[PDB]
Design an enzyme around this catalytic site. Structure first.
Site: not given
Ligand code: NAP
Ligand code: NAP
Lengths: 443, 442
Positions: B12, B15, B174, B212, B231, B236, B339, B427
């Site tokens: 929580a 990001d 999503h 996109e 991606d 999807h 599209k 394109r």
């Molecule tokens: N386009 C996409 O596919 C996409 C884009 C966005 C997010 N995501 C996925 O969403 C998930 C979370 O994304 P996020 O941006 O929130 O990630 P993040 O901010 O790097 O990780 C979220 C939380 O995890 C903890 N953390 C981060 N790195 C860690 C590590 N190496 N070891 C232990 N704890 C760690 C931290 O909390 P604490 O330090 O307080 O414990 C941090 O606040 C990921 O699995 C990511 O692949 C996917």
């Protein structure tokens, strides 16, 4: 290779204004076979000069075409004759035999006379004029009777003298995109056939609308009405192309055989699946749209002749059964349309969590799905009989079943003469048409 | 059985929680789409408080003053527990803090894995071993990446599916926009309606497009680790194909439709390197906005990157219903428009004159043409509350998906080919339109 095109009644308006010009256009675009003589027969004491004079008005002749026009009229000739009299045909046969390769030529006979004289001519062409080596093809014109019994007499006559593959019954009086109708629906069967059935389609409407009334010739129409004019022939043909089964081939008589299996399974439409209309004029609108059907010299007084008709048929068979087929055609409506609507069942209740509105396939230039709440007709029909394609020409069994379906209704409109619901020139039609549609499952 | 629900956001602090998860549960509370009695417990190593989380998130909440009364009621139900990801002590505290809520005992528990998949093994092990309700249901949301290839995916998959049942696992995707479940719903509808048409007897060529109009939008560094094929295509676009090519399902159940999806995948052979065109977007000088800036002009993208930003690929479904029927997948960032469309082209042949190929076009009513309230994330989150796995990749669906793209992906890592320059708002590369013509895409 060599062809003779014989116009019986070469003196009349059909020959004058339609036949001579439309083979003119055909020859003028190198669409006719290279070696082709045109030959006119009638009673009148005419020549090639008389027949250019009376018929070039409608040709639309230009300065550049002056050389071609003369090459066309080099290949025309005329022959005086009674239609009643054998020696007249004997004179005609010999005329054609004398022409270059006239003894071996294929022969195409255009009957541009009234069907009262059809018996005499078929019998005389048959007796005296048929080629021994070429093919012999009779183009017969509407009407093909006015009912089952009368169509059966005129037809059984022609078909005792002529094989089905020498008989071409032509229909072209419903506009120059009239063959196009028959080609896209036949095409839409090849693309969508697997989907066109009772397990997928809840309702079908075939709409054919004319925006213009009967514009002065309502004297010829008041004898026939809209069911005989459009429905019994054209709409029914477009119904068949929708309900038929992928044919055993692409050959005329394999698809015709399939259009008939449909027709055989349609039972005699009764009066309470019928809504008839008649166009009363428009005070509030310009043009000929002010003139009601009644208000025309050629139309008898208080004539209760249907101008519009809406009908519910059913194709009682495994593929379609309880699937109402609605036929809706009329004169003096709000537009010029030939559309088929295929309304699907309510098949997407679960997916989109809401009650989604009903889906529907429409054909009228690729056409579409929505959610509710150069050769032109005559030209192409001429080439088809030169080419031996009978695709777009109704067959004997086809025509009998056609009449079997509407004939009991039509005799009841003669005997009991009900009053067509009047409707304003320019309107969608009687509103009792819309109700009939709702009661049978239209949306 | 009951009316109460605990929403556990592991990570929580992070990001995703801040910019997407809190906002999207807030909006669902704001509109009373969540259960009446819903608690929201956040867990991470950061020593934070609800007010700390409130302050970082409330900028993204786009809150109005009418909603302030509703919004206190919300942050009321919010608690936060600090703790490590493989420390048994920590997880005890969390279990107790939940149990010390109204009906925690017999409340349903929903664990949002908002962490990188490096802590998944330990977080999954510990949730199972400590924190699961004994009357209520227990469901896990796992985030992308679902590993990077077959072998890396299988490891994570197997672990999770030795602790949790397939019906407890929700793999949420999503990141491809708002009409993204919509996308899937409408290709299912059209399948219901046009199925008997959709086969090799009636159809020459199938093509599914995902364009996109924008680039990587400053977050190139994240994308660069994955590529356009991981991606969009492997997730999807492969689901959009499954939904087109699949059999009349035996029922309207999740598991029945997902069965029919997997049957198509099982029959899809490994995509071959010479049926692939890769793009990368360079900048638009004449353009304006981010359209000025290429992929490599993103400051987070390492120099010398060859990460594909666009790909055409060609698969075959090798079975009865399809065969010699090429499925073409064409997707990319920074393209001429936005599209998601499937084109089914029919066979060519009444009009005594070469009349040009017809084709049925489903864009997301749509049409035949002669050629020559809720949004995705809200819906998917609800879908796990309401218990529908319809729009979530099943474990084995995902194994096949990796099986198809894994040889090619590894080929791309090894040989490191130079994707083709394509102008932002282009394109896509011309060589894509060439590939399509050679398999007969009109
Ligand atoms: N386009 C996409 O596919 C996409 C884009 C966005 C997010 N995501 C996925 O969403 C998930 C979370 O994304 P996020 O941006 O929130 O990630 P993040 O901010 O790097 O990780 C979220 C939380 O995890 C903890 N953390 C981060 N790195 C860690 C590590 N190496 N070891 C232990 N704890 C760690 C931290 O909390 P604490 O330090 O307080 O414990 C941090 O606040 C990921 O699995 C990511 O692949 C996917
Ligand atoms: N919607 C429709 O179905 C529609 C519309 C237009 C035309 N038609 C069809 O057109 C055909 C012919 O009509 P048309 O326009 O050519 O003009 P028509 O005057 O009806 O007949 C053409 C020619 O036939 C001869 N003829 C006419 N009545 C005859 C009779 N009672 N006995 C013997 N010969 C007779 C005359 O030629 P000679 O005296 O010089 O020998 C006349 O010039 C008809 O069969 C009609 O069904 C119908």
């Amino acid at each position: 290779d060599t062809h003779i095109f014989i116009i019986m009644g070469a003196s009349g308006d059909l020959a004058k204004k339609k036949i001579y010009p439309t083979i003119w256009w055909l020859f003028r675009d190198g669409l006719l076979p290279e070696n082709t003589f045109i030959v006119g027969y009638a009673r009148s004491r005419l020549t090639v000069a008389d027949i250019r004079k009376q018929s070039e008005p409608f040709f639309k002749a230009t300065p550049e075409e002056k050389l071609k026009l003369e090459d066309f009229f080099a290949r025309n000739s005329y022959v005086a004759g009674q239609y009643d009299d054998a020696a007249s045909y004997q004179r005609l046969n010999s005329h054609m035999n004398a022409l270059h390769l006239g003894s071996q030529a294929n022969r195409l006979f255009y009957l541009a006379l009234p069907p009262t004289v059809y018996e005499a001519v078929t019998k005389n062409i048959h007796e005296s004029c048929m080629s021994q080596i070429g093919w012999n093809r009779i183009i017969v014109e509407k009407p093909f009777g006015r009912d089952l019994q009368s169509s059966d007499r005129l037809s059984n006559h022609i078909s005792s003298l002529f094989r089905e593959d020498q008989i071409y019954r032509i229909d072209h009086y419903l506009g120059k995109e009239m063959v196009q109708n028959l080609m896209v629906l036949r095409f839409a069967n090849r693309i969508f056939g697997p989907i066109w059935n009772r397990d997928n389609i809840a309702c079908v409407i075939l709409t054919f609308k004319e925006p213009f009334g009967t514009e002065g010739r309502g004297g010829y129409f008041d004898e026939f009405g809209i069911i005989r004019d459009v429905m019994q022939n054209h709409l029914l043909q477009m119904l068949c192309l929708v309900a038929m089964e992928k044919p055993c081939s692409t050959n005329s008589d394999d698809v015709r055989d399939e259009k008939v299996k449909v027709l055989k399974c349609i039972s005699e439409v009764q009066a309470n699946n019928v809504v008839l209309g008649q166009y009363v004029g428009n005070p509030d609108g310009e043009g000929e749209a002010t003139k009601g059907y009644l208000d025309d010299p050629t139309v008898p007084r208080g004539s209760t002749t249907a101008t519009f008709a809406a009908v519910v048929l059913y194709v009682e068979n495994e593929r379609w059964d309880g699937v109402p087929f609605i036929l809706r055609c009329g004169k003096a409506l709000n537009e010029r349309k030939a559309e088929v609507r295929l309304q699907f069942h309510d098949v997407a209740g679960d997916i989109f969590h809401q009650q989604c509105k009903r889906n529907e396939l429409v054909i009228r230039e690729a056409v579409y799905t929505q959610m509710m709440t150069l050769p032109d007709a005559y030209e192409r029909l001429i080439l088809d009989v030169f080419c031996g394609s009978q695709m777009h020409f109704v067959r004997s069994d086809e025509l009998r079943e056609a009449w079997r379906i509407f004939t009991p209704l039509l005799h009841q409109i003669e005997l009991e003469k009900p009053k067509p619901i009047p409707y304003i020139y320019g309107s969608r039609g009687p509103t009792e048409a819309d109700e009939l549609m709702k009661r049978v499952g239209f949306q």
